[PDB]
A = this chain, B = another copy of it.
Amino acid sequence: PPGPPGPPGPRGPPGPPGPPGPPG
């Protein structure tokens, strides 16, 4: 029969580092 799509893929990569903090 027609093949259904497979399961959801792996979780994506971690996001990039955050911005620098406020100036001291």
Please list the residues of chain A having a beta carbon within 8 angstroms of any beta carbon in chain B. 1-24
Contact = CB atoms under 8 A, between A and B. Distances in A.
A12 to B, nearest CB: 3
Quickly give the copy total for this chain: 3
Contacts of A3: 1-6
Contacts of A22: 17, 20-21, 23-24
A13 B8 contact: yes
Contacts of A10: 5, 8-9, 11-12
6 contacts: A3-B4, A3-B6, A9-B9, A9-B11, A15-B15, A24-B24
Given A2-B4, A2-B7, A3-B1, A17 B13 contact: no
